[PDB]
Write a protein that binds this DNA or RNA. Structure first.
Length: 105
RNA sequence: AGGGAU
C-alpha cells in the first residue's frame, strides 16, 4: 500500500488579514487592498470559528506583495481592517515540495 | 465578535 501527493495552494508569497466584518467577503478584500488582481483571497478562522470571518491572501512574488502593502490597519466600511506582511524576495519556497523530484520532475 | 497592531 502506497500513495502520493502534491501542492498548489502554498507555492507563493503571502500576507495575513483580519478586521473583515463577520458579514462581508473576499469580493471586497481584493477590492480595497489595491487595484491588483483577485489572485489573492481566502477566508478562515477554524472548525470552531463560531461562523468564521477572518481572511488571508497570497501574491505573485514579493513585488505584488509590497504593491498591496499600503493599508496596515486601514478601513473598509465600519471596522479598522488590518493586514500584516508575510513575504520576502526569497521565500517563495523553503520548507516543502510538490513533486518526488526523482522520477516525475 | 472584535482588535489583535507593529
Amino acid at each position: 500500500g502506497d500513495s502520493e501527493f502534491t501542492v498548489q495552494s502554498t507555492t507563493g508569497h503571502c500576507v495575513h488579514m483580519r478586521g473583515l466584518p463577520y458579514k462581508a467577503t473576499e469580493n471586497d478584500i481584493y477590492n480595497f487592498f489595491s487595484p491588483l488582481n483577485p489572485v489573492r483571497v481566502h477566508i478562515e478562522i477554524g472548525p470552531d470559528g463560531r461562523v468564521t470571518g477572518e481572511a488571508d491572501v497570497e501574491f505573485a512574488t514579493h513585488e505584488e506583495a509590497v504593491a498591496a502593502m499600503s493599508k496596515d490597519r486601514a478601513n473598509m466600511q465600519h471596522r479598522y481592517i488590518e493586514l500584516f506582511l508575510n513575504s520576502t524576495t526569497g521565500a517563495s519556497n523553503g520548507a516543502y515540495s510538490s513533486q518526488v523530484m526523482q522520477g516525475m520532475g
